[PDB]
Ligand binder design. Sequence first.
Ligand SMILES: CC(Oc1ccc(O)cc1)(P(=O)(O)O)P(=O)(O)O
Ligand SMILES: CC(Oc1ccc(O)cc1)(P(=O)(O)O)P(=O)(O)O
Ligand SMILES: [Mn+2]
Ligand SMILES: [Mn+2]
Ligand SMILES: [Mn+2]
Ligand SMILES: [Mn+2]
Ligand SMILES: [Mn+2]
Ligand SMILES: [Mn+2]
Ligand SMILES: [Mn+2]
Lengths: 275, 275
Amino acid sequence: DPWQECMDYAVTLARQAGEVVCEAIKNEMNVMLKSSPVDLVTATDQKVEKMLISSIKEKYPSHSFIGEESVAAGEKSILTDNPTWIIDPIDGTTNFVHRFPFVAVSIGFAVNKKIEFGVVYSCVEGKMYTARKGKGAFCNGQKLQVSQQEDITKSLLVTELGSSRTPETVRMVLSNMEKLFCIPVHGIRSVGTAAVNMCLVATGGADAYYEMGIHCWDVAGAGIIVTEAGGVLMDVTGGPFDLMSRRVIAANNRILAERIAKEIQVIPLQRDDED
Amino acid sequence: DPWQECMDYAVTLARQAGEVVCEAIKNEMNVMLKSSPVDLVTATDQKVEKMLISSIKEKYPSHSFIGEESVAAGEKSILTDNPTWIIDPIDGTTNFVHRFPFVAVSIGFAVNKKIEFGVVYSCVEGKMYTARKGKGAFCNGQKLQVSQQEDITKSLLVTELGSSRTPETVRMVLSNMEKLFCIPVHGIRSVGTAAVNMCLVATGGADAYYEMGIHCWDVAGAGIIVTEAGGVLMDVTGGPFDLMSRRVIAANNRILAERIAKEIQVIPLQRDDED
Ligand SMILES: CC(Oc1ccc(O)cc1)(P(=O)(O)O)P(=O)(O)O
Ligand SMILES: CC(Oc1ccc(O)cc1)(P(=O)(O)O)P(=O)(O)O
Ligand SMILES: [Mn+2]
Ligand SMILES: [Mn+2]
Ligand SMILES: [Mn+2]
Ligand SMILES: [Mn+2]
Ligand SMILES: [Mn+2]
Ligand SMILES: [Mn+2]
Ligand SMILES: [Mn+2]
């Protein structure tokens, strides 16, 4: 693990950022909009992202960045082979402005376009999720393992309704949920952050997560936490996972993942690596 | 206060039960079915309820009970004027079976058919929610207050899909969710327990909860926590909350509650005081 120093620095930065987010979640909210009345942001997201990028630049000036709010400011979401930090300063902005207690700082680190480590700090909970390729996944000193469940009819899934309110899109998201729900599955849960939903699969508390519409910074930190806990990532088609494709299944195993893929009708989405 | 001693004792019992649940969620389980393959129970539910009822009976032998698993064993869900303990030994049985970290012990105490106090212990989180009529609502000794939000388009709701897998029922649950979602609201969350969903409204972290299909023991502990935090309970018709009706809206205020009620199509259900 030659990236141990980098990950340990990422953990300290995530904890620092988490403290900023915790302080801000107790204070007055000035909610701002991005593309729609349900695509939210605050000054805290922007402050935290700028702190993270400037701190990483100081120690690792040759590295590259992909950050949610930097992309909103016009930066590109193109992943080269160069070591790259893929940052979501606050995953769960809707939760944050409501003080719903699942908000995370997410950092994924890629080399040769492959994730080498991931850090997800659920900062109201004070849960530091981490994983390094080949070294396992952890939450606050506890090594993580996905569940063993291979029977979809005894599974607990996690998903979210999405940021679209387009009637045809909402109908397809609800149809997909209906089809899975009526297999049946034991249930479906929604805590409101992609990174925390995925970390819940890594812990074994849920058996699988799926969503269409995520961005690369939503899944770059948590994906490796799922796989180092023994899980799998794939596209909702069953095809290989792609960070820039807007789609993911993060599951305990390929049996549940492929069974979920068989019920998901795909919605058209703009890739993060294209204009 | 003639019921503060009962409340103090209820808190002690809820914490004791919660410690049993906490230990059991880490261990092997015997997962059993009740009315269907998605209506679950474990031996821990049954053990905890028997402990709670035997403990209350020894200290208050003239009091009555309505306990979830005792009703499953043939006891009646009739609420008289006699002091009555309305118990859910484990709210979130599906979550418990999956180790999804939101499970609660719920105790509501009614006199003359009106709730006088409520205790909800979210076991895995270690959060003790309490409220006595006229005395405020608390979480781990800290006073709670519902959110101020009166604009439904800036609200965060909590709800659940339900225990039914009947196609017509599921379609109606999802249609109700679609209508609210597309008002729009900011989002919908699902942590998997009625009592914890309601306590999230009492804290202000969510603006409102609604569900059809709950039972009296799901809402008897948490309802008073919502109202002592400054919120409201209502039927999905917009009318008075009815503890045995299977339906609830628990909101920060009447503006959001009535707006939610306007979108809900009522699902037919057998009342808890019907056979
Ligand atoms: C909506 C955002 O993140 C997600 C993604 C998927 C979810 O289920 C929840 C939150 P958020 O702003 O980070 O809160 P995104 O980064 O995609 O704009
Ligand atoms: C399903 C049960 O309670 C609920 C009720 C409503 C929910 O949204 C979640 C759990 P649970 O067994 O307590 O988990 P019920 O007491 O109704 O059988
Ligand atoms: Mn965003
Ligand atoms: Mn974000
Ligand atoms: Mn995000
Ligand atoms: Mn039950
Ligand atoms: Mn129960
Ligand atoms: Mn219950
Ligand atoms: Mn307003």
